Design an enzyme around this catalytic site. Structure first.
Site, PDB file in Angstrom:
ATOM      1  CB  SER A   1      -0.709   0.366   1.107  1.00 12.12           C
ATOM      2  OG  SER A   1      -2.026  -1.067   1.428  1.00 12.12           O
ATOM      3  CD  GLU A   2       1.591   3.916   3.599  1.00  9.99           C
ATOM      4  OE1 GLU A   2       1.887   4.613   2.909  1.00  9.99           O
ATOM      5  OE2 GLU A   2       0.818   3.579   4.635  1.00  9.99           O
TER       6      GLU A   2
END
Ligand SMILES: *[C@@H]1O[C@H](CO)[C@@H](O)[C@H](O)[C@H]1NC(C)=O
Length: 251
Positions: free
Chosen positions: A165-166
């Site tokens: 995600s990041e």
């Protein structure tokens, strides 16, 4: 009818990882852009086409299929074997609509960083890299039982959240991992502040005029913790791969 992206740790390289992230970035299907930066869709209710499934598998063949929200790129839940687990804060539509034909469970903790800390998973003490990813996958599979250990699921998802995600949201995080791929590294104050400020940065960038000037500066931190302020798009543009569509100023 969801898009799917795979990433295997077997024979994985910094290149297979980067290509994986760019495939994911495409399948999230952002719409339009702000100052040239791809802008994620504002709304996407239907669980039947608003999630991208990321199939994470390690050298042993253990598989964990992560459901990722196309508007926020956040992990809402996952499937291992014939079981599925969802964060306590996953919306009802997602809980009911995803991973059908599995024995479903709702975790007793949320997926936010402070919620994960409640389960002893802290960004400052959680290693990231290909090995930590292999172990995380392994642990998610090992805990595909009734009496699962929340601490193991929490730390494993913390690794997945940042490496998927990041990293997908930030080219900066993508590259911290890219050039430390075969090693074990823990995010510093710069990475953590970036992750914390994705929404604020996204809002200030999207609402800025042609000159890119932020209506309100955003505070970030250097690795050592020293604070600095982002007052224009250009200052942070090379670090961002995707923008969240934020309506009102977050805080
Ligand atoms: C932030 O910087 C301080 C030094 O001021 C350092 O001791 C600390 O470990 C850093 N935090 C992280 C997670 O990098």
């Amino acid at each position: 009818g969801l898009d799917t992206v795979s990433f295997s740790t077997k024979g994985a390289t910094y290149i297979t990882y980067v290509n994986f992230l760019n495939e994911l970035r495409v399948k999230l299907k952002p719409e339009g852009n702000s100052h040239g930066i791809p802008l994620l869709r504002k709304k996407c209710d239907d669980p039947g086409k608003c999630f991208v499934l990321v199939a994470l598998s390690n050298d042993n063949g253990q598989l964990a299929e992560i459901a990722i929200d196309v508007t926020s790129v956040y992990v809402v839940g996952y499937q291992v074997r014939n079981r599925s687990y969802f964060f306590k804060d996953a919306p009802d539509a997602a809980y009911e609509g995803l991973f059908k034909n599995t024995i479903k469970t709702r975790l007793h903790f949320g997926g936010s960083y402070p919620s994960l800390e409640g389960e002893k998973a802290y960004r400052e003490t959680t290693d990231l890299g290909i090995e930590p990813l292999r172990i995380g996958i392994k642990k998610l599979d090992e805990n595909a039982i009734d009496n699962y250990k929340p601490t193991e699921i929490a730390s494993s998802l913390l690794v997945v959240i940042q490496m998927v995600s990041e990293a997908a949201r930030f080219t900066f995080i993508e590259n911290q991992i890219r050039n430390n791929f075969q090693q074990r590294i823990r995010p510093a104050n710069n990475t953590i502040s970036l992750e914390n400020k994705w929404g604020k940065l996204s809002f200030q960038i999207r609402t800025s005029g042609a000159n890119g000037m932020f209506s309100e500066a955003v505070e970030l931190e250097r690795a050592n913790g020293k604070k600095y302020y982002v007052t224009a798009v250009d200052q942070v543009k090379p670090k961002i791969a995707l923008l969240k569509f934020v309506d009102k100023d977050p805080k």
